[PDB]
Write a structure and sequence with these properties.
The complex is a heterodimer of chains A (349) and B (26).
Chain A: E1 4-11, E2 18-23, E3 33-39, E4 42-48, E5 54-61, E6 69-76, E7 83-89, E8 94-98, E9 103-108, E10 115-120, E11 127-132, E12 137-141, E13 146-151, E14 161-166, E15 172-177, E16 182-186, H1 190-201, E17 208-210, E18 215-217, E19 227-231, E20 234-238, E21 243-249, E22 266-273, E23 284-286, E24 292-296, E25 302-306, E26 311-313, E27 322-327, E28 333-338, E29 342-348
Parallel strand pairs in A: 13-17
Antiparallel strand pairs in A: 1-29, 2-3, 3-4, 4-5, 6-7, 7-8, 8-9, 10-11, 11-12, 12-13, 14-15, 15-16, 16-18, 19-20, 20-21, 21-22, 23-24, 24-25, 25-26, 27-28, 28-29
Chain B: H1 2-19
The chains are: A mainly beta (349), B mainly alpha (26).
The structure holds ligand 7WD and yttrium (III) ion (2 copies).
Chain lengths: 349, 26
């Protein structure tokens, strides 16, 4: 159904892998389409214009030449509507950047190691989720500069957490990582709702230590799980086994909100099969309305599936691993970022 | 599918919250 044309490409002069890309979905209709890229010690902003034009806006260069940004995520200031960009990577430092000036507003130290992904709560712009090499997830309230909770410990992940996602209403998180597991952490529990409210009321702040998840499975994939997203009440997750698996906790007819923490079953609903994406750390993405699913492979091919029912986007110059993709909010534009620092723009026909 | 109906209604709620917002351009 969906068709795209490659209208432009460029290469960042640092020539290092680009691991993250995100359009700013908070921009109002009528405002310019903006996306950020992250790789090496760099954070770069670009604006999309007519006739495939990619306009460089500003570049953030970390004073630490050894920093390697892995992820970025957009939010806004709850009081002034001002756009904000969070970035993190190998150093395990979260930096809140002002995207209009490209200067860092503040930074958070805490994670014992590298941060693999950042996500903002879909309803509360102040709630930032970080997943780390230290086997834990952390929830921060960036308005009061407090660590709300740490998800890890006794029954937490046993190796690096690679990805996590909030569901559409921000009531729960699914995380995944190097231990091959996918774990559910409910944040609409009376305990978590109160811990969030308390973070707004803030002796130093006492963070919740959540050692036990609400569901756990190691029965979906047989290797590192590097990307997870909610698709309604269902889950989309992938490993390096050349498939995105669509699955759900419990038996076929089990309600996600009735799943007990000891639930032993999983139900597979289907698989999105592809090829040459058998290396670790390759993200898939969806558009805002979750009508499209995109994933790049290790040789520069871009797969796009229609979620309401597969298109393969290739260019002879795009041969490097596509680490992540991002759709514009209206889904008219798809950007792919690569291991060789190249950026590819695909416009919907 | 019933899950698609859940997606539609929940994304519509988020889009309405986005439509009520006027975030400053980058
Ligand atoms: N652990 C580790 N070793 C080496 C790296 N990382 C994690 C890091 C970030 C990452 C994590 C999951 C999926 C990803 C992703 O980048 C693009 O797709 C990339 C490089
Ligand atoms: Y409690
Ligand atoms: Y506990």
């Amino acid at each position: 159904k969906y068709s795209f044309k490659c209208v432009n490409s460029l290469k960042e002069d640092h020539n290092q892998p680009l691991f993250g890309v995100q359009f700013n979905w908070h921009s109002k209709e009528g405002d310019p389409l903006v996306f950020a890229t992250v790789g090496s010690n760099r954070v770069t902003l670009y604006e999309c214009h007519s006739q495939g034009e990619i306009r460089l806006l500003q570049s953030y260069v970390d004073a630490d030449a050894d920093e390697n940004f892995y992820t970025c995520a957009w939010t806004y200031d709850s009081n002034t509507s001002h756009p904000l960009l969070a970035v993190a990577g190998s150093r395990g430092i979260i930096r809140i950047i002002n995207p209009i000036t490209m200067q860092c507003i503040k930074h958070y130290v805490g994670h014992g190691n590298a941060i693999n992904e950042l996500k903002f709560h879909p309803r509360d712009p102040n709630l930032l989720l970080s997943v780390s090499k230290d086997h834990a997830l952390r929830l921060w309230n960036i308005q009061t500069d407090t660590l709300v909770a740490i998800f890890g410990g006794v029954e937490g992940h046993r190796d690096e957490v690679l990805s996590a996602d909030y569901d559409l209403l921000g009531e729960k998180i699914m995380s995944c990582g190097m231990d091959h597991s996918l774990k559910l952490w409910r944040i609409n529990s009376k305990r978590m709702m109160n811990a969030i409210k308390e973070s707004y009321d803030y002796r130093p702040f006492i963070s919740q230590k959540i050692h036990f998840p609400d569901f756990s499975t190691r029965d979906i994939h047989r290797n590192y799980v590097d990307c997870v997203r909610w698709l309604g009440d269902l889950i989309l997750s992938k490993s390096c086994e050349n498939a995105i698996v669509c699955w759900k906790p419990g038996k076929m007819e089990d309600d996600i909100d009735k799943i007990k923490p000891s639930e032993s079953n999983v139900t597979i609903l289907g698989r999105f099969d592809y090829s040459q994406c058998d290396i670790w750390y390759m993200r898939f993405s969806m558009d805002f309305w979750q009508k499209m699913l995109a994933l790049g492979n290790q040789v520069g091919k871009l797969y796009v599936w229609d979620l309401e029912v597969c298109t393969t986007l290739t260019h002879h110059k795009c041969g490097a691993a596509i680490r992540q993709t991002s759709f514009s909010r209206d889904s008219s534009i798809l950007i792919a970022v690569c291991d060789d620092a190249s950026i590819w723009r695909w416009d919907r026909l | 599918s019933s899950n698609r109906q859940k997606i539609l209604e929940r994304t519509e709620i988020l889009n309405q919250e986005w439509k009520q917002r006027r975030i400053q351009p980058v």
